Each structure stands twice: as structure tokens, then as C-alpha cells.
């Protein structure tokens, strides 16, 4: 067929119950993740094609960058709690990988301050148990799909995107194929 198990996607041996409809894992330390988000804009292209009633969820991972990697997972939880994901994604990616001015938890906070999040608001969220649960949720999700690497995307807790089985192309055919495959999976 046009879309084939083992080609554009694989199937989880153990489907995850109650998973987000479209779940992406990433790290701000991850060079491929920088390419995926900031150059290829995969998330954005996926969302443009998604079915009515399907939302995209994005979780950070701890395993790259040691202490700072975990600080970034905690900061991403703060971003989800405050609903400011689309204001901090670009400057966090740029601060970690382009300027490399993000080296400490305080440097992360500066990005939020600069994007207009009040200090008080950020600090209350950072130290909150709502954010601690959001960190645990991200960690649990990684365990549930038995995550090996980033970037990664899973659909309906059942299927895993397989970019290595797509065409590496003009980046644009690649991105269209990735996005098309997510839409196909969402209706599967």
C-alpha cells in the first residue's frame, strides 16, 4: 500500500492506554530536534493537516544535557502550566544551541522573563506541585512508549513515526510525507 507498517511508521507491541492523540518527544539539547522544529517545522506542518478534534502534545525529555536537561524538562512543564509554549520554544532552542547562552536554570528563567512572563509567575509555577506532576507525566509518557531517542512522535498511543523509512529528499517532500503519515495514522 501507500502507507506501510515498517516503512513510514511502526506499531507498538504494547499500545498505550489514554495517550495523547499526537505525542511528540523532544529535547532542547537535541540537534536533530532543533532541525525538526526550527528548520523543518514538522510540528507546524503536522498540525496544519490534523483532523477535526485532534490535538498535538509535545513533551520534553531528561536524558540529554544532565542537570540542565532536567531543568529544561521542568521549564517546559512551566511553559505548559502557563500556556506559553509558543512564546518560549524558539528562544529556548536558540539559547541552548545557537547562542549557547543557556547554561543554568537561571538562564532558562531569563528567557521567560524576556518573553514577558512575570518573575513571580514563573517562580510560583517552577516551585509548584502542578509543575512537578507535569514533569512526572512527561517522564511516565517516555516510559510508556519505551522511548529510545528523540525526536519522536506517537499517534493514538499505538503507532510510531519512522522518518528513516521516508524519503530524505528535498526537505520539503520529507516534511510533507511525515505530516501526511501523521494524518493517515490519526484516522487509523
PDB file of C-alpha atoms in Angstrom:
ATOM      1  CA  UNK A   1       0.000   0.000   0.000  1.00  0.00           C
ATOM      2  CA  UNK A   2       0.860   3.698   0.093  1.00  0.00           C
ATOM      3  CA  UNK A   3       1.428   3.724   3.865  1.00  0.00           C
ATOM      4  CA  UNK A   4       3.067   0.566   5.248  1.00  0.00           C
ATOM      5  CA  UNK A   5       3.867  -0.784   8.710  1.00  0.00           C
ATOM      6  CA  UNK A   6       7.656  -0.954   8.895  1.00  0.00           C
ATOM      7  CA  UNK A   7       8.070   1.804   6.324  1.00  0.00           C
ATOM      8  CA  UNK A   8       6.699   5.270   7.250  1.00  0.00           C
ATOM      9  CA  UNK A   9       5.618   4.060  10.676  1.00  0.00           C
ATOM     10  CA  UNK A  10       5.879   1.169  13.122  1.00  0.00           C
ATOM     11  CA  UNK A  11       3.388  -0.325  15.567  1.00  0.00           C
ATOM     12  CA  UNK A  12       3.966  -0.504  19.323  1.00  0.00           C
ATOM     13  CA  UNK A  13       3.930  -4.054  20.692  1.00  0.00           C
ATOM     14  CA  UNK A  14       2.179  -2.637  23.745  1.00  0.00           C
ATOM     15  CA  UNK A  15      -0.250   0.174  22.860  1.00  0.00           C
ATOM     16  CA  UNK A  16      -0.501   2.903  25.476  1.00  0.00           C
ATOM     17  CA  UNK A  17      -3.884   3.451  27.070  1.00  0.00           C
ATOM     18  CA  UNK A  18      -5.120   7.022  27.413  1.00  0.00           C
ATOM     19  CA  UNK A  19      -2.231   8.538  25.470  1.00  0.00           C
ATOM     20  CA  UNK A  20      -2.360  11.970  23.810  1.00  0.00           C
ATOM     21  CA  UNK A  21      -3.679  11.678  20.223  1.00  0.00           C
ATOM     22  CA  UNK A  22      -0.458  13.030  18.720  1.00  0.00           C
ATOM     23  CA  UNK A  23       2.517  12.934  21.073  1.00  0.00           C
ATOM     24  CA  UNK A  24       5.945  14.370  20.257  1.00  0.00           C
ATOM     25  CA  UNK A  25       9.069  13.911  22.397  1.00  0.00           C
ATOM     26  CA  UNK A  26      11.969  16.319  22.055  1.00  0.00           C
ATOM     27  CA  UNK A  27      14.911  17.931  23.829  1.00  0.00           C
ATOM     28  CA  UNK A  28      16.195  21.480  23.633  1.00  0.00           C
ATOM     29  CA  UNK A  29      19.699  19.875  23.694  1.00  0.00           C
ATOM     30  CA  UNK A  30      18.951  17.717  20.658  1.00  0.00           C
ATOM     31  CA  UNK A  31      20.481  18.931  17.385  1.00  0.00           C
ATOM     32  CA  UNK A  32      18.052  16.902  15.276  1.00  0.00           C
ATOM     33  CA  UNK A  33      15.237  18.386  17.375  1.00  0.00           C
ATOM     34  CA  UNK A  34      16.471  21.863  16.535  1.00  0.00           C
ATOM     35  CA  UNK A  35      16.321  20.892  12.848  1.00  0.00           C
ATOM     36  CA  UNK A  36      12.883  19.327  13.242  1.00  0.00           C
ATOM     37  CA  UNK A  37      11.334  22.345  14.949  1.00  0.00           C
ATOM     38  CA  UNK A  38      13.290  25.389  13.784  1.00  0.00           C
ATOM     39  CA  UNK A  39      14.233  24.443  10.185  1.00  0.00           C
ATOM     40  CA  UNK A  40      11.793  21.722   9.073  1.00  0.00           C
ATOM     41  CA  UNK A  41       8.891  22.959  11.230  1.00  0.00           C
ATOM     42  CA  UNK A  42       7.489  19.414  11.475  1.00  0.00           C
ATOM     43  CA  UNK A  43       5.157  20.104  14.423  1.00  0.00           C
ATOM     44  CA  UNK A  44       3.705  23.059  12.499  1.00  0.00           C
ATOM     45  CA  UNK A  45       3.223  21.026   9.316  1.00  0.00           C
ATOM     46  CA  UNK A  46       1.669  18.128  11.216  1.00  0.00           C
ATOM     47  CA  UNK A  47      -0.838  20.470  12.904  1.00  0.00           C
ATOM     48  CA  UNK A  48      -1.837  22.001   9.553  1.00  0.00           C
ATOM     49  CA  UNK A  49      -3.098  18.664   8.368  1.00  0.00           C
ATOM     50  CA  UNK A  50      -4.640  17.257  11.543  1.00  0.00           C
ATOM     51  CA  UNK A  51      -8.298  16.107  11.729  1.00  0.00           C
ATOM     52  CA  UNK A  52     -11.071  17.945  13.498  1.00  0.00           C
ATOM     53  CA  UNK A  53     -10.905  17.165  17.221  1.00  0.00           C
ATOM     54  CA  UNK A  54      -7.260  16.087  17.293  1.00  0.00           C
ATOM     55  CA  UNK A  55      -4.737  17.992  19.352  1.00  0.00           C
ATOM     56  CA  UNK A  56      -0.903  17.848  19.324  1.00  0.00           C
ATOM     57  CA  UNK A  57       1.011  17.346  22.589  1.00  0.00           C
ATOM     58  CA  UNK A  58       4.737  17.947  22.989  1.00  0.00           C
ATOM     59  CA  UNK A  59       6.852  16.601  25.901  1.00  0.00           C
ATOM     60  CA  UNK A  60      10.489  17.279  26.808  1.00  0.00           C
ATOM     61  CA  UNK A  61      12.946  14.532  27.815  1.00  0.00           C
ATOM     62  CA  UNK A  62      15.619  14.405  30.517  1.00  0.00           C
ATOM     63  CA  UNK A  63      18.299  12.151  29.088  1.00  0.00           C
ATOM     64  CA  UNK A  64      20.277  14.805  27.181  1.00  0.00           C
ATOM     65  CA  UNK A  65      22.194  17.508  28.996  1.00  0.00           C
ATOM     66  CA  UNK A  66      22.416  16.233  32.577  1.00  0.00           C
ATOM     67  CA  UNK A  67      21.279  18.733  35.216  1.00  0.00           C
ATOM     68  CA  UNK A  68      20.422  21.347  32.591  1.00  0.00           C
ATOM     69  CA  UNK A  69      18.459  18.788  30.588  1.00  0.00           C
ATOM     70  CA  UNK A  70      16.250  18.181  33.616  1.00  0.00           C
ATOM     71  CA  UNK A  71      15.954  21.905  34.310  1.00  0.00           C
ATOM     72  CA  UNK A  72      14.673  22.180  30.730  1.00  0.00           C
ATOM     73  CA  UNK A  73      12.081  19.479  31.324  1.00  0.00           C
ATOM     74  CA  UNK A  74      10.968  21.418  34.408  1.00  0.00           C
ATOM     75  CA  UNK A  75      10.889  24.681  32.446  1.00  0.00           C
ATOM     76  CA  UNK A  76       8.871  23.066  29.700  1.00  0.00           C
ATOM     77  CA  UNK A  77       6.410  21.949  32.403  1.00  0.00           C
ATOM     78  CA  UNK A  78       6.251  25.619  33.466  1.00  0.00           C
ATOM     79  CA  UNK A  79       5.559  26.524  29.847  1.00  0.00           C
ATOM     80  CA  UNK A  80       2.700  24.027  29.685  1.00  0.00           C
ATOM     81  CA  UNK A  81       1.276  25.180  33.041  1.00  0.00           C
ATOM     82  CA  UNK A  82       1.282  28.840  31.977  1.00  0.00           C
ATOM     83  CA  UNK A  83       0.269  28.179  28.380  1.00  0.00           C
ATOM     84  CA  UNK A  84       3.308  29.930  26.912  1.00  0.00           C
ATOM     85  CA  UNK A  85       4.808  27.125  24.810  1.00  0.00           C
ATOM     86  CA  UNK A  86       4.704  29.174  21.582  1.00  0.00           C
ATOM     87  CA  UNK A  87       6.485  32.097  23.202  1.00  0.00           C
ATOM     88  CA  UNK A  88       9.440  30.228  24.615  1.00  0.00           C
ATOM     89  CA  UNK A  89      10.116  27.393  22.144  1.00  0.00           C
ATOM     90  CA  UNK A  90      12.192  29.453  19.733  1.00  0.00           C
ATOM     91  CA  UNK A  91      14.284  31.332  22.307  1.00  0.00           C
ATOM     92  CA  UNK A  92      14.955  28.148  24.337  1.00  0.00           C
ATOM     93  CA  UNK A  93      16.163  26.313  21.216  1.00  0.00           C
ATOM     94  CA  UNK A  94      18.292  29.308  20.226  1.00  0.00           C
ATOM     95  CA  UNK A  95      19.639  29.857  23.729  1.00  0.00           C
ATOM     96  CA  UNK A  96      20.691  26.245  24.175  1.00  0.00           C
ATOM     97  CA  UNK A  97      22.018  25.521  20.665  1.00  0.00           C
ATOM     98  CA  UNK A  98      22.586  28.720  18.698  1.00  0.00           C
ATOM     99  CA  UNK A  99      23.887  31.376  21.100  1.00  0.00           C
ATOM    100  CA  UNK A 100      24.659  28.750  23.799  1.00  0.00           C
ATOM    101  CA  UNK A 101      23.847  31.374  26.432  1.00  0.00           C
ATOM    102  CA  UNK A 102      21.676  28.917  28.360  1.00  0.00           C
ATOM    103  CA  UNK A 103      23.841  27.116  30.891  1.00  0.00           C
ATOM    104  CA  UNK A 104      21.940  27.251  34.114  1.00  0.00           C
ATOM    105  CA  UNK A 105      18.408  27.217  35.433  1.00  0.00           C
ATOM    106  CA  UNK A 106      18.663  30.977  35.864  1.00  0.00           C
ATOM    107  CA  UNK A 107      19.480  31.408  32.159  1.00  0.00           C
ATOM    108  CA  UNK A 108      16.326  29.488  31.315  1.00  0.00           C
ATOM    109  CA  UNK A 109      14.262  31.744  33.571  1.00  0.00           C
ATOM    110  CA  UNK A 110      15.723  34.798  31.821  1.00  0.00           C
ATOM    111  CA  UNK A 111      14.180  33.608  28.529  1.00  0.00           C
ATOM    112  CA  UNK A 112      10.750  33.556  30.156  1.00  0.00           C
ATOM    113  CA  UNK A 113      11.293  36.964  31.760  1.00  0.00           C
ATOM    114  CA  UNK A 114      12.382  38.364  28.413  1.00  0.00           C
ATOM    115  CA  UNK A 115       9.278  36.868  26.753  1.00  0.00           C
ATOM    116  CA  UNK A 116       7.107  38.747  29.221  1.00  0.00           C
ATOM    117  CA  UNK A 117       6.315  36.125  31.861  1.00  0.00           C
ATOM    118  CA  UNK A 118       6.380  37.804  35.279  1.00  0.00           C
ATOM    119  CA  UNK A 119       9.147  36.614  37.606  1.00  0.00           C
ATOM    120  CA  UNK A 120       6.622  35.910  40.369  1.00  0.00           C
ATOM    121  CA  UNK A 121       4.524  33.845  37.964  1.00  0.00           C
ATOM    122  CA  UNK A 122       7.472  31.815  36.746  1.00  0.00           C
ATOM    123  CA  UNK A 123       8.818  31.188  40.236  1.00  0.00           C
ATOM    124  CA  UNK A 124       5.440  30.132  41.608  1.00  0.00           C
ATOM    125  CA  UNK A 125       4.994  27.713  38.689  1.00  0.00           C
ATOM    126  CA  UNK A 126       8.583  26.418  38.889  1.00  0.00           C
ATOM    127  CA  UNK A 127       8.184  25.511  42.546  1.00  0.00           C
ATOM    128  CA  UNK A 128       4.623  24.172  42.223  1.00  0.00           C
ATOM    129  CA  UNK A 129       3.366  20.635  42.572  1.00  0.00           C
ATOM    130  CA  UNK A 130       1.321  21.141  39.410  1.00  0.00           C
ATOM    131  CA  UNK A 131       4.657  21.511  37.615  1.00  0.00           C
ATOM    132  CA  UNK A 132       6.137  18.525  39.494  1.00  0.00           C
ATOM    133  CA  UNK A 133       3.227  16.402  38.285  1.00  0.00           C
ATOM    134  CA  UNK A 134       3.759  17.729  34.750  1.00  0.00           C
ATOM    135  CA  UNK A 135       7.412  16.652  34.936  1.00  0.00           C
ATOM    136  CA  UNK A 136       6.348  13.202  36.130  1.00  0.00           C
ATOM    137  CA  UNK A 137       3.758  12.983  33.329  1.00  0.00           C
ATOM    138  CA  UNK A 138       6.435  13.652  30.729  1.00  0.00           C
ATOM    139  CA  UNK A 139       8.734  11.052  32.310  1.00  0.00           C
ATOM    140  CA  UNK A 140       5.900   8.486  32.548  1.00  0.00           C
ATOM    141  CA  UNK A 141       4.938   9.045  28.921  1.00  0.00           C
ATOM    142  CA  UNK A 142       8.522   8.294  27.857  1.00  0.00           C
ATOM    143  CA  UNK A 143       8.399   5.054  29.854  1.00  0.00           C
ATOM    144  CA  UNK A 144       5.035   4.070  28.347  1.00  0.00           C
ATOM    145  CA  UNK A 145       6.210   4.252  24.708  1.00  0.00           C
ATOM    146  CA  UNK A 146       9.589   2.782  25.772  1.00  0.00           C
ATOM    147  CA  UNK A 147      11.315   5.791  24.270  1.00  0.00           C
ATOM    148  CA  UNK A 148      14.794   5.269  22.807  1.00  0.00           C
ATOM    149  CA  UNK A 149      15.615   8.522  21.120  1.00  0.00           C
ATOM    150  CA  UNK A 150      14.425  11.968  20.111  1.00  0.00           C
ATOM    151  CA  UNK A 151      12.809  13.463  18.140  1.00  0.00           C
ATOM    152  CA  UNK A 152       9.929  11.004  18.179  1.00  0.00           C
ATOM    153  CA  UNK A 153       6.230  11.082  17.535  1.00  0.00           C
ATOM    154  CA  UNK A 154       3.484   8.609  18.503  1.00  0.00           C
ATOM    155  CA  UNK A 155      -0.113   8.569  17.340  1.00  0.00           C
ATOM    156  CA  UNK A 156      -3.061   7.337  19.437  1.00  0.00           C
ATOM    157  CA  UNK A 157      -0.591   5.524  21.706  1.00  0.00           C
ATOM    158  CA  UNK A 158      -0.309   2.874  19.011  1.00  0.00           C
ATOM    159  CA  UNK A 159       1.899   3.924  16.090  1.00  0.00           C
ATOM    160  CA  UNK A 160       5.415   5.415  15.944  1.00  0.00           C
ATOM    161  CA  UNK A 161       6.549   7.695  13.135  1.00  0.00           C
ATOM    162  CA  UNK A 162       9.504   6.216  11.231  1.00  0.00           C
ATOM    163  CA  UNK A 163      11.326   9.039   9.410  1.00  0.00           C
ATOM    164  CA  UNK A 164      14.142   6.633   8.493  1.00  0.00           C
ATOM    165  CA  UNK A 165      11.667   4.918   6.153  1.00  0.00           C
ATOM    166  CA  UNK A 166      10.655   8.122   4.363  1.00  0.00           C
ATOM    167  CA  UNK A 167      12.469   9.983   1.568  1.00  0.00           C
ATOM    168  CA  UNK A 168      15.282  12.303   2.804  1.00  0.00           C
ATOM    169  CA  UNK A 169      14.551  14.255  -0.297  1.00  0.00           C
ATOM    170  CA  UNK A 170      14.139  17.898  -0.688  1.00  0.00           C
ATOM    171  CA  UNK A 171      13.480  18.507   2.971  1.00  0.00           C
ATOM    172  CA  UNK A 172      10.012  19.559   1.803  1.00  0.00           C
ATOM    173  CA  UNK A 173       8.933  16.173   0.374  1.00  0.00           C
ATOM    174  CA  UNK A 174      10.266  14.642   3.582  1.00  0.00           C
ATOM    175  CA  UNK A 175       8.263  17.057   5.747  1.00  0.00           C
ATOM    176  CA  UNK A 176       5.122  16.593   3.656  1.00  0.00           C
ATOM    177  CA  UNK A 177       5.450  12.825   3.895  1.00  0.00           C
ATOM    178  CA  UNK A 178       5.964  12.993   7.653  1.00  0.00           C
ATOM    179  CA  UNK A 179       2.918  15.249   8.062  1.00  0.00           C
ATOM    180  CA  UNK A 180       0.825  13.119   5.652  1.00  0.00           C
ATOM    181  CA  UNK A 181       1.748   9.966   7.589  1.00  0.00           C
ATOM    182  CA  UNK A 182       0.667  11.536  10.885  1.00  0.00           C
ATOM    183  CA  UNK A 183      -2.704  12.454   9.360  1.00  0.00           C
ATOM    184  CA  UNK A 184      -3.108   8.942   7.974  1.00  0.00           C
ATOM    185  CA  UNK A 185      -2.315   7.441  11.400  1.00  0.00           C
ATOM    186  CA  UNK A 186      -4.718   9.752  13.213  1.00  0.00           C
ATOM    187  CA  UNK A 187      -7.607   8.279  11.198  1.00  0.00           C
ATOM    188  CA  UNK A 188      -6.418   4.701  11.552  1.00  0.00           C
TER     189      UNK A 188
END
